[PDB]
Amino acid sequence: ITPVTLANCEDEPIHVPGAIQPHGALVTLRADGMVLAASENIQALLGFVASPGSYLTQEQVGPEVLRMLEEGLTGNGPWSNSVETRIGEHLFDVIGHSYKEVFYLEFEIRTADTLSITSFTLNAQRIIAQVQLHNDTASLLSNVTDELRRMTGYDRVMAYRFRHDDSGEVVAESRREDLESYLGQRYPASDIPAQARRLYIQNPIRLIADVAYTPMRVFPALNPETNESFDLSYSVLRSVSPIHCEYLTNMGVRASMSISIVVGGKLWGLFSCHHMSPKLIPYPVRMSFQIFSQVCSAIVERLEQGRIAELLRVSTERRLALARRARDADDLFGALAHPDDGIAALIPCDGALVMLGGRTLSIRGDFERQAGNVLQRLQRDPERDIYHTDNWGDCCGVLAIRFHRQESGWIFWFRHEEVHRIRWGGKPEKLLTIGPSGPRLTPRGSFEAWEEVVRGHSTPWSETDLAIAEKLRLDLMELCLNH
């Protein structure tokens, strides 16, 4: 019965809302096919009253439907299927699935004049051609963002990248003129709490037909079998958190639809479609996106590792240049401090320090004091050959490696505090009408929430950055020992 406030919202059970969106009806069955619960609108949408204890009957739901249901009813492992069928006055999409051991049948009115197979195929071809045309991982995102809008007619579609700390960044955008831009927006991991994030990962597509909707409750609330709520995780019609709904209306959005990009076990980022008026996307089309989601995820994965590959390649090429120079010139300092192949170019940094013997070369600033303090901190830890941190002198980020012990051969890279890369301003943008929860649920409030998180922090060191440092360290050890 608990109200969901700003304090609660992190722990909101959004998977068991026990209600569904109004653009469809829902019937929940148990293993034997016996009805356990239904949305309060089954009668109003489909001509009949589903009742707990009942079993579904032909042409109160039609034949092919039970035909489908029986197949999944007798199959081990998460059944999933859909049928198209006429029930009374209308034809329906009857998407059905089984999660836990409860079976779900979802009913959407089908208004499309097209054959489903071809509608599905047509859109799949169109939206994944965008995945064959681009080598830049960012062109991919940018282009499919522009294309998703062309296909769906959404007012605004955005592409979101998720950082290491699960903070988001709007990296692409295609929007109707009128609308303010959110390009370069940054938001915290708290604006998509655990359960919501778990769900985007498990579900390629989420659709919100109308944010201003009144939910259609499924009765009864609790599954008699367990005396605990129905887990609508894989339910297409599952209802929305009032918090998110308030957020979206603060923005002035009325319909959403998001396509996930999952790589590893991580939500790599999603495409979020917004509309200013309510909007619906037919089932077969959503399936076009679902399959797309899986392929795009695959290509983004490769494109990303193709990116790291090239980073490693030019790094070694520079380690080669470095090895070449060092042996022939015989001062390392000159080699390391080289403007372009220098260490400052090896790994993205705002500065670097080279330190062998008693001599100190600070390149791109005065870093001698910091390096001294960092080194003192490592006093307590004589065995550390590598040190790094984004919390901390005057530079937040530090990556230090040791290549000579006795003569204190050290290398440092430094990073300043992370800064909002792109920022809007210039003319006060319009007044958002703000709900009861407060300004926290506006983009402006989200950004501020993000600042408070990152400030005091430099950008984390790449998986890649550390790998390079490690290779460099090996190089110099080799050199110093060798000659």
Ligand X SMILES: */C=C/C1=C(C)C(=O)N/C1=C\C1=NC(=C\c2[nH]c(/C=C3\NC(=O)C(C=C)=C3C)c(C)c2CCC(=O)O)/C(CCC(=O)O)=C1C
Positions at the binding site: 9
User: Could you give the CA distance from residue 120 to residue 113 in angstroms, rounded to a whole number?
Assistant: 13
Q: Which of residues 140-159 bind ligand X (CB under 6 A)?
A: 158
Member of 28, 256, 288, 459 binding ligand X (CB under 6 A):
256
Residue 252 CA to residue 245 CA, distance in Å, equals 10
> Which window, 96-104, 295-303, 390-398, 440-448, contacts ligand X (CB under 6 A)?
440-448
- The verdict on 9 binding ligand X (CB under 6 A) reads yes
Q: How many residues bind ligand X (CB under 6 A)?
A: 27
**CB of residue 259 to ligand X, shortest distance in Å:** 9
Rank residues 254 and 415 by Cβ distance to ligand X and give the closer one. Answer: 254
- Report the alpha-carbon distance of residue 203 to residue 274 in Å, rounded: 18
* 269 touching ligand X, by CB under 6 A: no
446 binds ligand X (CB under 6 A): yes
- Residues 395, 370 contacting (CB under 8 angstroms): yes
Asked whether position 162 contacts ligand X by CB under 6 A, the answer is: no
Strand ranges (DSSP E) for 120-265?
156-162, 168-175, 186-187, 205-208, 216-219, 222-223, 228-229, 255-263
If binding is defined by CB under 6 A, does position 437 make contact with ligand X? Answer: no
The upper half-sphere exposure of residue 270, i.e. CA atoms within 13 Å in the direction of its Cβ, equals 26
Binders in 10-69 for ligand X, by CB under 6 A? 10, 14
Residue 451 contacts ligand X per CB under 6 A? no
Q: In whole angstroms, how close is the CB of 139 to ligand X at the nearest point?
A: 20
Distance CA 388, CA 469 (A): 11
Residue 76 phi/psi, 5° resolution?
-80, 140
Determine, following the binding rule CB under 6 A, whether residue 252 of this chain makes contact with ligand X: no
Q: Find the binding residues for ligand X in span 217-246 (CB under 6 A).
A: 240-241, 243-244
CA separation for the pair 286, 288 (Å, rounded): 5
**Residue number with CB closer to ligand X (232 or 396):** 232
Q: Is 261 in the site for ligand X (CB under 6 A)?
A: no
Torsion angle defined by CA atoms of residues 118, 119, 124 and 130, in that order, rounded to the nearest 10 degrees: 120
Residues near 118 by Cβ (< 8 Å), separated by ≥ 6? none
Q: Shortest Cβ distance from residue 312 to ligand X (Å)?
A: 32
Cα gap 104→235, rounded to integer Å: 8
Min dist CB 247 to ligand X, Å, is 5
- The annotation places the binding site for a tetrapyrrole at 9
Nearer to ligand X, 203 or 370 (CB): 203
Contacts of 385 (CB under 8 A, 6+ apart): 401, 402, 473
The answer to the question of residue 286 lying near ligand X (CB under 6 A) is no
Show contacts with ligand X in window 174-203 (CB under 6 A): 182, 185, 187, 190-193, 196
SS3 of 444, please?
Answer: helix
Contacts with ligand X by CB under 6 A lie at: 9-10, 14, 158, 160, 170, 182, 185, 187, 190-193, 196, 206, 208, 240-241, 243-244, 247, 256, 258, 272, 441, 443, 446
